[PDB]
Design a protein around this ligand. Sequence first.
Ligand SMILES: [Zn+2]
Length: 378
Amino acid sequence: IQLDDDARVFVQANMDCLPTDWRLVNKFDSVDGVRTIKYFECPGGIFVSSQGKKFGYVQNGSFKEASVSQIRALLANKVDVLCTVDGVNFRSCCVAEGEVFGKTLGSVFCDGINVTKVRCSAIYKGKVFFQYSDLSEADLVAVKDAFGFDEPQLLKYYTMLGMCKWPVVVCGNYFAFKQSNNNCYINVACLMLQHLSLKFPKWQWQEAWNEFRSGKPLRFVSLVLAKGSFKFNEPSDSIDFMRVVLREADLSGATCNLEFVCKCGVKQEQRKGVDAVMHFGTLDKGDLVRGYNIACTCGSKLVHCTQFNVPFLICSNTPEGRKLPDDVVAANIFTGGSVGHYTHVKCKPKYQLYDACNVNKVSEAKGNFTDCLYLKNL
Ligand SMILES: [Zn+2]
C-alpha cells in the first residue's frame, strides 16, 4: 500500500482485529473536496482516515493529519493524576492512557519510583506525581519550605531515591539494610535512630520519618544523603549521617551547659538542640560530668558539662577499645583493616551484635567503639 510505516502498522493491526468501541468503514468520501479513505469509526464521531498517504482523522467535516500516537491518545480514556513539587499543593492533570508520563509531565516520581518512562494506566488514577524539572522561583520556594532543599539538593534527592534500592529486613524488633555500596554506616546509624522519638518541622521529613518508623526507611535515607555531602558508594562516618538527621529534627527543648578551659582561655556556653545531644571526644557520659580533654590549637582543652536538659545523649569518639560505660543503650563499632566495616551492639536486656542482618548474643566485644547512645540518667 502507500501508508506511512506507523500508520500502516496501526491501520492494518486493527483490521484483522477490529476493537470493541469501533466499526469498519472501509469507504471513500470527499472531505473538503479532497478524496479521503475512511478506515474506521470511533467514539466521538472520529473517523481514522487517509488522504492518500497523509494520515489522520475526520471530525465533523474537517481532516486533521496526526501521528498514530495522537490518535491513539484521542481515543483512549484519560487518566487523572495529582502533580506536585512539594506534597503540599497538588494539581489534577490528565494523561492519555498508554502514553508515557514524561511526555506531558517532565521528570516524575510516583510512590518512590521514577515513572518518567512508564506508560500510563488506570492503576495510576489519583496517584501523586512528584515533578522536579523546569522549576520556577515559586516552585523552589515551595521546595525550600517542604524539603529544606535548593535545586541541586532536590536533584540529588531524586538521584538517591533512584539508586538506593537496598532491601530492608526485620531483625528482632528492628530493621536492617542488606549490605552493599558501603552502606553499613547508614545501617548502624539507622539502628541507633530506631531508639529515638523525633519530630521534624519540615513536612517531607516528618512524612519520611513516619515511613521510617513503620519499617520503610529508604525515602528518609535518601533525604539525608541529599541534605549532606554523601556520595553514593563511598564510605562515610555513621556520626555524620546521625548529625544530619538530628540537625533536621525539632530538639528545641534540649539544652546543656558546657565549660571549656585551655590556653586560649575560658568559655561557658549553653548549647541547644543537636549541639546539646551530640558530644565528641569521649564515649562515656560520666566523663562529661567529671571533665575530659579534647584537642585544640593550643594543645588540649578541658571540657566539662555542668547541666543537662536532654531527651538522650550520643557520645562519639575516634574508634577505641574500652569497656562499655555502664549506662550505654546501643553502640557503633568500627572494625578497621583493609576496608572498614561498621557493626552495632544493643545492650539491654541482652547484649547483642547486629551485623548486616544478623543478630547474635555477644560473647566478647572489646571495641573499637565510636558512638554510644544514652537514654537514662542524664
Ligand atoms: Zn586552646
